[PDB]
Amino acid sequence: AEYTLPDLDWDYGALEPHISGQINELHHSKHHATYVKGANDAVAKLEEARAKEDHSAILLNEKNLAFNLAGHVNHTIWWKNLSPNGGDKPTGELAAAIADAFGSFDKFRAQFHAAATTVQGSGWAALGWDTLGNKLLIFQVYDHQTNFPLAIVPLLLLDMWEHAFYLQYKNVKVDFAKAFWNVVNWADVQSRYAAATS
Amino acid sequence: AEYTLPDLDWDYGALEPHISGQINELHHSKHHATYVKGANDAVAKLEEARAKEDHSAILLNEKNLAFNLAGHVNHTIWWKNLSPNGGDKPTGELAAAIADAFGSFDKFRAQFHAAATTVQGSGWAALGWDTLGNKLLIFQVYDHQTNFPLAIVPLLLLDMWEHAFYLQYKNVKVDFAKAFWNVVNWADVQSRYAAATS
Amino acid sequence: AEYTLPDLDWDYGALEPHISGQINELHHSKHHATYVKGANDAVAKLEEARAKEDHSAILLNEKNLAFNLAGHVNHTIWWKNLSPNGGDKPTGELAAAIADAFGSFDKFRAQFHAAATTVQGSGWAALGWDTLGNKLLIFQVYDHQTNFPLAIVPLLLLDMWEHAFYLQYKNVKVDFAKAFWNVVNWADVQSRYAAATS
Amino acid sequence: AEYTLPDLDWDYGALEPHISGQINELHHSKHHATYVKGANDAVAKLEEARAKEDHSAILLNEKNLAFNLAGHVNHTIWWKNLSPNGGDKPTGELAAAIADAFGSFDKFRAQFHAAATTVQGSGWAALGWDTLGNKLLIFQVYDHQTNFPLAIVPLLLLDMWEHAFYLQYKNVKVDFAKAFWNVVNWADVQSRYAAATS
Numbered sequence: 068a069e070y071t072l073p074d075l076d077w078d079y080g081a082l083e084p085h086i087s088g089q090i091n092e093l094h095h096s097k098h099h100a101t102y103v104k105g106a107n108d109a110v111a112k113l114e115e116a117r118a119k120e121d122h123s124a125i126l127l128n129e130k131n132l133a134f135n136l137a138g139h140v141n142h143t144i145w146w147k148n149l150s151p152n153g154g155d156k157p158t159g160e161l162a163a164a165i166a167d168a169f170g171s172f173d174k175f176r177a178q179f180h181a182a183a184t185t186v187q188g189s190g191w192a193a194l195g196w197d198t199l200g201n202k203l204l205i206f207q208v209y210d211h212q213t214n215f216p217l218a219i220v221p222l223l224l225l226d227m228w229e230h231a232f233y234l235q236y237k238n239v240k241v242d243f244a245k246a247f248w249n250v251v252n253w254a255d256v257q258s259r260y261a262a263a264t265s
Numbered sequence: 266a267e268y269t270l271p272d273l274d275w276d277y278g279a280l281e282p283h284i285s286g287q288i289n290e291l292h293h294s295k296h297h298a299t300y301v302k303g304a305n306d307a308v309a310k311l312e313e314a315r316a317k318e319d320h321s322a323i324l325l326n327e328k329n330l331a332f333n334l335a336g337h338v339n340h341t342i343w344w345k346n347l348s349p350n351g352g353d354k355p356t357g358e359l360a361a362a363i364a365d366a367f368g369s370f371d372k373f374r375a376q377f378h379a380a381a382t383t384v385q386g387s388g389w390a391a392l393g394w395d396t397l398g399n400k401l402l403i404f405q406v407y408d409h410q411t412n413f414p415l416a417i418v419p420l421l422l423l424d425m426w427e428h429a430f431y432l433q434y435k436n437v438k439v440d441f442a443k444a445f446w447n448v449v450n451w452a453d454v455q456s457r458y459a460a461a462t463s
Numbered sequence: 464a465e466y467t468l469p470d471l472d473w474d475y476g477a478l479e480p481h482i483s484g485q486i487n488e489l490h491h492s493k494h495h496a497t498y499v500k501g502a503n504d505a506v507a508k509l510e511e512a513r514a515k516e517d518h519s520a521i522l523l524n525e526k527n528l529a530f531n532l533a534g535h536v537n538h539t540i541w542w543k544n545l546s547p548n549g550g551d552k553p554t555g556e557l558a559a560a561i562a563d564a565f566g567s568f569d570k571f572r573a574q575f576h577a578a579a580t581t582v583q584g585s586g587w588a589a590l591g592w593d594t595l596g597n598k599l600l601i602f603q604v605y606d607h608q609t610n611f612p613l614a615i616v617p618l619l620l621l622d623m624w625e626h627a628f629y630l631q632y633k634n635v636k637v638d639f640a641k642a643f644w645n646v647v648n649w650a651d652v653q654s655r656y657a658a659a660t661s
Numbered sequence: 662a663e664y665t666l667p668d669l670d671w672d673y674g675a676l677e678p679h680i681s682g683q684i685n686e687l688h689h690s691k692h693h694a695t696y697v698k699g700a701n702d703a704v705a706k707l708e709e710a711r712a713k714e715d716h717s718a719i720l721l722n723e724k725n726l727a728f729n730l731a732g733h734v735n736h737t738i739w740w741k742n743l744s745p746n747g748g749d750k751p752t753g754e755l756a757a758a759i760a761d762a763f764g765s766f767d768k769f770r771a772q773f774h775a776a777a778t779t780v781q782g783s784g785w786a787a788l789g790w791d792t793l794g795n796k797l798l799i800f801q802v803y804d805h806q807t808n809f810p811l812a813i814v815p816l817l818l819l820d821m822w823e824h825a826f827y828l829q830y831k832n833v834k835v836d837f838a839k840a841f842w843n844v845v846n847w848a849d850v851q852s853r854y855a856a857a858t859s
């Protein structure tokens with residue numbers, strides 16, 4: 068069926084003071100909803116093109132599909148990766164997986180922090196699992212859909228688009244990237260990891 | 266372990282006359298091998314950065330990782346999607362899946378053909394499965410890693426980079442895009458689809 | 464010599480209420496300054512590479528050069544295109560140039576408004592002059608350096624990166640794109656145009 | 662008026678054996694002509710949108726305009742930068758300009774060679790003049806329109822898209838990048854430079 072805006076598992080102001088409730092409400096209710104609507108529209112426009120047998124706008128359609136679907140995919144994961152009862156460090160299989168792939172938790176954190184804070188434009192930092200070579204890798208994503216391979220399964224993501232922190236941290240993106248550690252939902256990341264290696 | 270260049274399941278000239286053996290040997294033995302080496306190098310450079318605690322080149326490293334890993338992922342699938350005993354049309358669950366998602370096999374073929382022939386630069390046409398909305402979608406990929414969402418599982422891909430057809434078809438990319446139908450390995454696409462919906 | 468942060472021709476709060484003084488001070492003193500420093504650094508890193516005869520980081524260097532130099536170029540023009548004693552409509556040669564290239568001033572405004580409000584990520588709307596075909600064209604620029612040809616001379620630009628309006632207009636980018644008309648410095652655009660056609 | 666395919670100042674096979682006549686004829690008569698037609702079409706589609714007051718396809722239109730106009734601009738310069746009576750080294754003001762901006766002619770050549778051979782996809786190496794900081798810089802351009810600032814004036818360009826060398830050099834792009842030095846038309850580069858600093 069249609070793409071739908073997911074409900075949050077917590078109240079908008081539940082992440083304060085790391086992420087303000089004013090940001091969570093605009094981010095959720097305005098930005099995310101838009102990508103949901105844009106993905107729904109792109110799918111519909113592609114159905115119409117097929118019906119009318121006219122693909123003169125294929126480049127635009129495939130671009131709208133990709134951009135909005137990725138916005139949609141990315142924020143859906145973001146809301147799940149976040150929690151009021153979060154923070155701390157990972158435990159168990161993930162904790163071992165991460166120390167083995169990055170050296171240590173701290174070494175993973177510094178690479179993820181550098182990937183998140185050096186984007187030249189809108190982007191995200193992403194922890195994903197490569198099915199091909201069976202490794203945990205960090206990716207720096209441009210906008211929502213560029214700079215990563217096909218078939219990677221996302222585990223943890225950090226939204227580095229300006230709207231994610233501007234009202235609260237203004238231009239100091241590093242402070243925002245550091246506060247994030249406090250609200251990560253490791254239960255969720257652990258779960259995704261289990262699925263990905265299954 | 267390391268990324269490795271896969272072996273082909275057929276002789277280089279087994280796809281003639283649709284794809285020449287001269288192209289398959291350069292494509293496999295030179296282009297693909299390079300991406301394999303580049304992915305192996307990027308992984309190694311990221312290990313070194315972690316060791317020396319220096320991420321001043323993070324943007325370059327994450328870009329090399331993404332580009333080569335995607336080149337690697339993309340060609341690995343390409344070789345499997347191809348066969349001497351191929352062509353014809355899909356059968357069974359896939360055949361029904363495709364008619365249901367695109368209208369008909371022919372309607373799917375025209376959209377894939379338009380996506381493949383309208384790239385403005387290097388790119389590919391890709392048939393993938395969206396886990397989020399549980400739909401089969403076509404994506405137009407730029408280079409190897411741009412213009413699609415995270416977590417999509419690739420089913421069929423058509424290499425539209427110039428090196429894929431230049432020696433044989435020269436600038437007539439449409440003739441190459443049409444000959445491709447003759448060598449598609451539907452057994453492989455079917456298999457990927459089963460896995461993806463499992 | 465070195466790239467330098469230009470001085471404004473007006474006080475930070477001189478554009479209120481269309482653009483808040485709080486935005487002008489962060490935008491100028493923090494964002495722009497950064498691009499100035501990044502361009503200065505890239506030029507220096509390229510000199511070092513030449514000296515040590517090592518271009519293993521050429522892709523990174525050319526990317527840093529391009530991104531920061533463009534950020535620098537773009538904001539430098541932005542500050543000049545803005546004025547407290549601005550707004551209204553163009554007059555003279557430009558006014559005729561624009562009606563001739565776009566139909567009418569209003570038709571130019573609607574295209575520029577659509578280009579500015581539909582970017583999928585960070586970007587700008589840009590009015591430039593094509594030396595090759597001697598025409599005035601509108602370009603939609605991605606980030607600071609993508610999606611336009613070489614040798615185009617920029618006349619008017621509208622900053623659509625989130626930091627340009629977020630604190631004041633939040634997600635309502637269209638209201639920001641509409642307020643801009645009130646502070647455009649047509650004297651400046653006219654001047655650039657004369658130079659470009661000279 | 663309309664964009665038009667320029668005539669060459671030499672016969673297609675005049676650059677042998679560095680660049681084959683078979684490549685020059687496909688490159689000129691097929692690839693370039695296409696960009697000319699695409700630019701002419703984009704300009705026309707934008708006029709229609711203005712007339713019908715409908716900019717629902719603005720993103721596509723501005724992308725087609727940019728891509729084809731840049732293809733057009735880039736190849737037009739390429740044909741001029743090439744000559745049968747070329748090669749050797751620059752002389753006079755340019756020769757001094759280049760040694761001053763890069764160290765030496767050889768140091769300029771190695772950077773340009775690295776920029777040309779490391780593109781990850783279609784691209785070009787470009788020698789341009791920055792009006793803002795009054796410096797000669799090298800840019801690595803992605804496709805035809807990305808990765809450089811507005812207002813730069815192009816002086817020398819090297820086409821690194823596969824179609825530029827594939828038939829002759831196959832995957833050995835470095836040999837092609839080295840043969841180019843033999844056919845550069847320094848008279849042309851000198852001329853552009855004079856204009857740019859005027």
Ligand SMILES: [Fe+3]
Binds near residue numbers: 094142
């Ligand atoms: Fe966001």
Ligand SMILES: [Fe+3]
Binds near residue numbers: 292296340428429
């Ligand atoms: Fe290929």
Ligand SMILES: [Fe+3]
Binds near residue numbers: 490494538622626627
């Ligand atoms: Fe800005």
Ligand SMILES: [Fe+3]
Binds near residue numbers: 688
């Ligand atoms: Fe070319």
